[PDB]
Amino acid sequence: QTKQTALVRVENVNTREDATWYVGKRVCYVYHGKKVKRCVRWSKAPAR
């Protein structure tokens, strides 16, 4: 395997023409750690 490229399967997208619509869109993987560390707007918005 080559780990620099990942493969993603999206609900209700079952066709190559469908998948072309998403070329260029942004993608996110959300998880959690063990401690609280720095984030965006750590000072402006302490609620985050």
């Binding site: 609900e11 209700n12 997208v13 469908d18 619509w21 998403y22």
Partner: protein
Amino acid sequence: VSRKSPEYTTLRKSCAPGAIAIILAGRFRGRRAVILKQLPHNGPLVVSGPMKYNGVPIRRIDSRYVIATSTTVDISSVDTAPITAEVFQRTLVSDARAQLQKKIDAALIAAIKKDAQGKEKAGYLRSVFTVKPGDAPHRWNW
């Protein structure tokens, strides 16, 4: 025409003033607003709710974080909003911006009411957009 001239733009034709847009990101994600104009030097768009309907004030926004639908409202408001209105010096609203908001929103509401299908357009502006289970946004017209 000249690229250095502030009048020079490259905005896609869908994002034209009076078009009704869906917010895709930020604090007001999912709301529908009305595109007022584009700032000079190929800058951001400026949109307003109006704030009575959905609570969206006058605000700058990148055209890449918007879906410009084909539904339009004819606008002929004063549109005296320059770059200086959104620049600040190095529940609380200044008494100038607070007045500008009213001056624009009254005219915008008059335009929507004067339009045919005014009631339907007002409800459309009040509604909220979301992605439901089973939805396929890549197959839709807008």
